[model samples]
Target: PLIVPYNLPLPGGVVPRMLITILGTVKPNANRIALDFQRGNDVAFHFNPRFNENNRRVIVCNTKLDNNWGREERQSVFPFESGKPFKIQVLVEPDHFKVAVNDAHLLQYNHRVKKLNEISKLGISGDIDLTSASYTMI
Candidate 1:
């Protein structure tokens, strides 16, 4: 059974046309959820959805290198709600990543770490229940 704080390899690492999918349900009391694309200790992409940030529901995205986080990109339109199932798909392109939630386009994050191949693993955690996480090339 899959659980929170799960870590998995990215198979051949992130590449153009690759898609990563995650299925999960938000806990009724969820405050936050995080999905990170990682290489060693460095985080290439940090996708976070916050339900309780000064009463503002937002999605915060960032990058971390050498133990420091870069500028945060926040999206004010929230697509997820507590106690509901959600689908997240992260599509990798040559220069950026396109993310969608529940089949709707959510955001685009330009590559901060240009070396996409180094991003060989993914880490998922937080107050939500994970159903499955997988990746594919299309």
Candidate 2:
């Protein structure tokens, strides 16, 4: 499991995507939950066993609907022991990738690929014990 502290807000009119690399053996077919806010209002996705690999990578993006004219709050709590689950929050605006994680407030890369609609799907690949993971629009 991995523990990361991220405090970056998505600009009200922009979209962002995140690629998280989970390191460790995940629960077979365990539900992938994204916990948003403290309300426990989270979303769950089926854990794909095929994508379970050491140093595996998962991609998550904000949908066009999520980046339209309004903004939402997002937050997550992972069951990462000491340091196991590593994640990369890729902020995909209209033109770049602002990555954040263990690193401070900074823009990690700029990849101008895929239109805004292509990012609605949140892709996660891995098999690990997920105590809880979620986020919300604020």
State which candidate has the highest lDDT: 1
Q: Which stretches of candidate 1 lie over 4 Å from their true place?
A: none
Candidate 1 lands at a TM-score of 0.97
Model 1, 13: alpha-carbon shift in Å? 1.2
TM-score of each: 0.97, 0.32
Per-candidate local distance difference test: 0.92, 0.32
Q: Which pairs of residues have clashing backbones in candidate 1?
A: none
Residue 133 lDDT, candidate 2, scale 0-100: 34
Put down candidate 1 lDDT per residue, 1-138, tens digits, no spaces: 487898978878888999999999999999999999998889999999999999889999999999999999999989999999999999999999999999999999999999999899989889888999999998
TM-score, predicted candidate 2 vs. hidden true structure? 0.32
Model 2, residue 98: displacement in angstroms? 2.0
lDDT of 2: 0.32
